Design a protein around this ligand. Sequence first.
Ligand code: ICS
Ligand code: ICS
Ligand SMILES: [Fe+3]
Ligand SMILES: [Fe+3]
Lengths: 477, 477, 522, 522
Amino acid sequence: MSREEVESLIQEVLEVYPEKARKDRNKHLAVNDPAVTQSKKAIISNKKSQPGLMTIRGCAYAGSKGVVWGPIKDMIHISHGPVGCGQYSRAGRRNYYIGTTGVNAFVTMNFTSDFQEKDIVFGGDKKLAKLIDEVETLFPLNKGISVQSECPIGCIGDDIESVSKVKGAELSKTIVPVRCEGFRGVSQSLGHHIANDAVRDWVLGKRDEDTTFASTPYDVAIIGDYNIGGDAWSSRILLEEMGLRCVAQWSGDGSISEIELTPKVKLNLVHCYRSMNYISRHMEEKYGIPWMEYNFFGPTKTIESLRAIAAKFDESIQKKCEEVIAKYKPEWEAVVAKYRPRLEGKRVMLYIGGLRPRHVIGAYEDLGMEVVGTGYEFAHNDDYDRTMKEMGDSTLLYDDVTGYEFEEFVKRIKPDLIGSGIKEKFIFQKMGIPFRQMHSWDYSGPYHGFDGFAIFARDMDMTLNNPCWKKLQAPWE
Amino acid sequence: MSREEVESLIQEVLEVYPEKARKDRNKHLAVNDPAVTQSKKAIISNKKSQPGLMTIRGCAYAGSKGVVWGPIKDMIHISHGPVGCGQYSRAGRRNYYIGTTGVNAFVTMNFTSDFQEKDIVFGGDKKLAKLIDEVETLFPLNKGISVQSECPIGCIGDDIESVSKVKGAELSKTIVPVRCEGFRGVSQSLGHHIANDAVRDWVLGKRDEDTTFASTPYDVAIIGDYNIGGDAWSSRILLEEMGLRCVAQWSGDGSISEIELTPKVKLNLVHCYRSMNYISRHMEEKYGIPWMEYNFFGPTKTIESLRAIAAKFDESIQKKCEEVIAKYKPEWEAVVAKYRPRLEGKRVMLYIGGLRPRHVIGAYEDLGMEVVGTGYEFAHNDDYDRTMKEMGDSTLLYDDVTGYEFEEFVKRIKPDLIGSGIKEKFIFQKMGIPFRQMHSWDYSGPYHGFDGFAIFARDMDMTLNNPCWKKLQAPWE
Amino acid sequence: SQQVDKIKASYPLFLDQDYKDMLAKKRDGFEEKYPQDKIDEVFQWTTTKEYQELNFQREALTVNPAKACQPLGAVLCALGFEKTMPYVHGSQGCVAYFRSYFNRHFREPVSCVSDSMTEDAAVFGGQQNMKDGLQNCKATYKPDMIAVSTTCMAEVIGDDLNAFINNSKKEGFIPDEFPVPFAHTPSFVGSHVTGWDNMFEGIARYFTLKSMDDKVVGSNKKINIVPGFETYLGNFRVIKRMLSEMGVGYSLLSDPEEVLDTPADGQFRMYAGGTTQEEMKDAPNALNTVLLQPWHLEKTKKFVEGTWKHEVPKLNIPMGLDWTDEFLMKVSEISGQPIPASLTKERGRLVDMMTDSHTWLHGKRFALWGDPDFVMGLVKFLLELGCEPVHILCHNGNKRWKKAVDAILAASPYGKNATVYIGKDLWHLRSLVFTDKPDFMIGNSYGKFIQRDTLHKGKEFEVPLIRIGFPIFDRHHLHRSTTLGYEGAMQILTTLVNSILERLDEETRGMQATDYNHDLVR
Amino acid sequence: SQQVDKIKASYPLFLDQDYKDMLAKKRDGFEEKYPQDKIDEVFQWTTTKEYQELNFQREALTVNPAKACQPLGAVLCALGFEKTMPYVHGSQGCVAYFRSYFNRHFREPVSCVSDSMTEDAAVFGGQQNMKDGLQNCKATYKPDMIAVSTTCMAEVIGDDLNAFINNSKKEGFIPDEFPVPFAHTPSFVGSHVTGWDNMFEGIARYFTLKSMDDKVVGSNKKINIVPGFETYLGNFRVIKRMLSEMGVGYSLLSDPEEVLDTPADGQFRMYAGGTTQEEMKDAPNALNTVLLQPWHLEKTKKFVEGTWKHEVPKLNIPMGLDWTDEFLMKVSEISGQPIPASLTKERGRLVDMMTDSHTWLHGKRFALWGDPDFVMGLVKFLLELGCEPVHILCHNGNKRWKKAVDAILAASPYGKNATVYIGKDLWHLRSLVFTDKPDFMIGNSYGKFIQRDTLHKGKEFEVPLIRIGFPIFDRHHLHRSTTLGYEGAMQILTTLVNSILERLDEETRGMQATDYNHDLVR
Ligand code: ICS
Ligand code: ICS
Ligand SMILES: [Fe+3]
Ligand SMILES: [Fe+3]
């Protein structure tokens, strides 16, 4: 498709909308031009969703409890409010961890205050204080509590900050109040920011005047890797084979102690810019710790990141880096040799959250596939600043795409593979279009690093070339 | 039911038959008189089955391979002939054993020569010799081979005896040829006899001139307990708590060495008289070993049997005997106290093989049940000699009962519970009559001994009093 | 590292030695983890009766609930109507969860919209979100009906749905004749099954309340069927099949089985089948209305009895032998149609299977949870099989329901060891299966973490999970099963006895240790 | 010893210490058992490729076969006819085994008689047994038909069945018009599927060979359906269901589904349903005849094509997607009936289930065995799912059949690692699953001892058994399920994918070791 043709498709799809929605959605759809550096004049992002168009977005509680705080394994996170949020978000996200669940780790559990009408009418602050005591009794090995506010807490106006302060002082325990009610913001993205500020205000500074940790010049932190299918582990091993010491992982397989230690590191390695750039900028501003963005998707980006990170240290780290690259070179070359011939030329459309829509592109090109359309649920313009240079010219971009737009774009563009979420997966399987979950990795992974590239390649091949896709039309039809 | 009513019932059922079958079957049906000692004048047994009347009997191969030889665990038993017999009889009988199957034990395996038409025409003797070599190669820890003849072997004129001698001499291995072809005899019973003669002629005398086995005055052998669901183990523990040493078990969990050691015992304890009395008499005649029949079904018979066995030894054994009874007294009295009230007065009809139709009556009577009818598939008249003193007056007796007879008797007698085989079970459950398999124990057991009585009672209660039996009639009918 | 021809995913990749060594260094260096001796000591403590008493003393903390919030049931109710779009007035995050929750259970598309109220709507209310939302929904996805429910946010601020919807029509955002039934579905009341009830009453009201003058009970010679919150496709299908078997005219009100099982033939169908608007409007003319799950259809019952003047029969959920019998007999009486021979045969075949597998089922002890009507029906069938329900948990049950289940238990010798728990959660039940261990659990996927916990104490303490209920996320296509009627009873029975035999086979699989009982024939 | 309130059966009774001590003294005293080191050394040897090479050089020994003998299939064939008594001329032990074998698989009564030939018949022949047996059987059990097969005894001695039956009718043991079809069924030829073929051709000949003059192909507008040796009740029902759905007139020849599933309502039914004699007599007037399992209906095909002049179409067993498609298209062509919309939807729902579960099924490696038509259909469906059939065993398969399956494997990339074995037994397959380990086996209950052996080598070497086939003795009521058609394809697929996930859940159940991959959602 040509630039003009893509522009026609956008306009043809927008015809179905009422005038108010049509005017807005037009600003969120664009034909990519890799030369542009300020994406703001081609596409608008991080704006309110139009009512009733079936957005794929979640809420701020999802961005705070589900994404940032929940993975932290040795704390207990209270879904504060009615029973829904904590149940639908119970163990849906594959942020992996090592622990004894129910004893010293609590990730896949659902703690909730289960609001009833009596709590709405009279407030939940008394229940929350009692709830905190009960947690301390039945789970004595927890190392901290967070209170994830659901919609009514702000509406009812409860004062969870006072409860956290009073109960935290009484029980000499870290209790973190998070005002991540779902009516705040417009997407999961404000949940990230609220959560980052909660980490900043209540946890990160506890070891400011504690000098106990012996630092070395090679101390880093993995910032913004939530260990989906083990991603952070297959990223950590490469960093430490290179000779660096990973003090912390934010927050996949993360412990509260290794959050408190992070202001002691020498470099913050940021994978997910969207959800974690806020605390990174803070730690540069408060502790003078530099941060840099990296990418561990596919060998090309992994090699580029390893070399870029090692350059920030000394010759010894750079020598080890080339030894890491040499070690795995036959491994990923074997993966490419096997699978690129099975995937060369295939075209894929993506729709994910705030990072992966641009971050996995290089991995697909390492297997000879072409990303013909991509978009985010909730990214900002500095994400699109980083996207347009990564996509080919005249490809299609869509911010906060509606169900109707995505289906119609797919009908026209006819991709060979689609990579999106669970609310999209089964729609496109019905249309006979191979689909891979690019949130949960379809219960596979890891995809990060060299070891992950092998799984990524295997997965894309298994689904795209599966025999099932040749059988949808009955031979008598 | 009076004698005049049971007699009329027998005659009414027989009116369906042609004259020839009517005259014969009349001889195999009787109304019990406990005073009778010469049962031949009241009932005929061990005769051919009338053609086409759906006998429940099996064949002599079943009595030899299935019953007597198959349980011997460290031997390999060849089902010699076409594929059928060895497959239908593979692991159908729960003769339990301790071993590493396929390595040093082989009970639940099906070895066969799988005759094709070329073997019928040219004979199988050459195939048999080659099969023995292949057994020796692939199963090196086998301690002996048996050849269980199926129907065609004798008709084809094969000479398996010459093969066993030549191959047994060549390989210095015990190879036992058994002429248990199914056309021999009239039932499983002749299979017992043929197998007993094979043990005598090829195995039992191998340690006649070997005096290296250390004898004690308390050495016994359990003869004719095939360890169904563990029957022989729960009997062996009582004998050894009594102070006896059980040198061998024939043939449940039995090894070929303990058979070879049996001529060294002081007393043969025979449970199954039908299947094992032949080898018992032979061992009295040749080695001077006495034998006695005993009964380990239910506490009453088990106590009487334990005391009868102990009386054959010295005062010390008798002392341990009364100590055994005292230990288990509270246990079986607790079983009686719980289950007899749930079963008191219930009436049972039995039909089994050659021992249990009389042997288990005491167990039922210990639970307050009344055996109103019993019969055997293949018993002889000395089995019926021992039965009539154990059955109530004017109860119904049937030898080699036909399917038509058994159903008609049950329709008239209306027992509360029936105990028989797998070919009977599902007929009477359709009729809404609780049924217990009295061959396989319905995959439960053991029933022998004190520990077996607790299971026996539990099973009878669970089936007879189960809620399913109150639901067969549709409420709108 | 990876072997290209034997690629390892997360399991067993991270069991490689270099990964083990890395993870040990992460723990030791920076996690400040509790000593393994202390972890072992605390775990053992959480299995004790001492811990259980503290556990059941909870008044404010809930752990691992076994229920969801109202609008989830309102969504499922709405999906059962022809060309209807579920629409949840409130915050959009809620809909993202509802769809994903159902996506993962049914492995099907689930369509549902929000009007995305934000903090602006928290102060000024969400009237504008409703106006633009209905217009955008109707133009973009072209439904014939929009059924509106609410998230907790909208309920707290007190949005007037009736006023908003009226104003949308008066100001021209959607045609005045376009059907927009609604129901208030606050998540802080009841549970997901309450939302289904509330939504159904809202739809039934919309189409009949102001048009009862021309209705005559019994005039259309049908029976109405209200299924309630139902997540087994087979349960929709077995009811319709049995009624067609007897030649009974019926109308299934809320029928999502077509739209939750569309073929993968190259096109995505947003809508398929469902109860028609015509069927709702005509429903008062039926002979009567039967409620398949009465214990969460009480507001629907009041409306049907109070407005349609139907004598709603006192029937339990048709699960097991007795209650399927009573269901068919009541239907036969209302319709005048006799129970055909084919159903009488199907019944007798269930009895046959009960007689075929009664010895393995006798005395087996179960812990079970779920929604009220499902749970009691399951308890009833277990008693009919001669099994012992021991721990019965219904997080969203009430005292009235508990008394009714306690009476069922009192009527059978097999209920002598049962206790019914209401308002208790799956952390309560975990303690129960440690202190008073049953043979199995019957529950949804959340029970797998209880099985994990029990096994960690020891193999002899493991309580295997049997997956019957909602949601089931970690097995495929079990949503296709059946639990109602004889057919459903047949499937449950086969599941129970073969779960038992599977576990026996595992316990007797050790050669020369336990395989003396590794029978070929069971 | 026993505790009255917790009575122990053989397992775990004999794990009590006093029983362990006793069995230890039994072994050491009198069993002269091989030292455990030698036992472990020999077992390890039986898992090696060296042992496999010796294993596959066998020429005379068969161990653990995967087949039965002819008359067993002749009995099952006979049972499918109205008020017909199976009657096996020969020795009675065979009939006692045929009945018990089927009793344990169907958990139903199985009726069959013998005429109890004894040793005197080896010299004099068994005519008197046939005479009295036919009279006795007809008078006592009052069948409308008696279908005669033979045991190997009667075949070696050479009894003339036709002469014996003709003399029985001549002399008045049975009426001359009473139907007594027969077939010679030597157990040393072929297997049980051969006996089914022989008996069916013998019955078909009896009712049609001498009456062909007034027959006109296509005059009754039906299609004859021959199911062959079939032990899943659902397979009879699914064929009848789809043909009725298309409104196709048909006659299922040999139909035991009613008699193998009679209700437990207080009365025992010796006979129920079945193909009528009039359906056999009228069969030549059909449009055509379709063979559901053609690879063991070769004699039937020759007669149907040679005598009835039916152009029997070349159809594979309707298993999987492609072969159910072809079956329905061929029936549509012969009958003139279109494939209705309901069956097109069912197909599309099967396709959806394949798209929903393809990721867990991809690359999974199977060893499988069974009868020829079942095995090849299973191999075809595994390929359609993207599974790798690795070891394909058919003990009773032939060269031509092997050639046909190899071609199917050659047409798909997922057959690159497959090997087809004929004439090999389950002891051969045990070596294959040790040397070339697959993820699962798909077979009958006899495979449970292979899983035991593999586990003994180590948990990482265990190959779990998926129970599809015949016989299934150690689970209840799997005989009611389906393998044919879309319905069967959905059931196989659900069983496979969920067996994969059950094993994953067990492999990831270890806390803090492997439960990082114990996902809630799969
Ligand atoms: S990587 Fe993260 S859960 Fe930063 S694991 Fe998750 S494609 Fe979310 S809020 Mo799915 S930290 Fe990306 C995310 Fe955000 S998969 Fe996507 S949408 S911006
Ligand atoms: S007669 Fe008895 S149940 Fe001793 S009734 Fe039964 S052919 Fe069994 S353990 Mo069937 S006391 Fe014989 C028997 Fe043993 S029929 Fe056979 S196998 S050696
Ligand atoms: Fe689907
Ligand atoms: Fe049955």
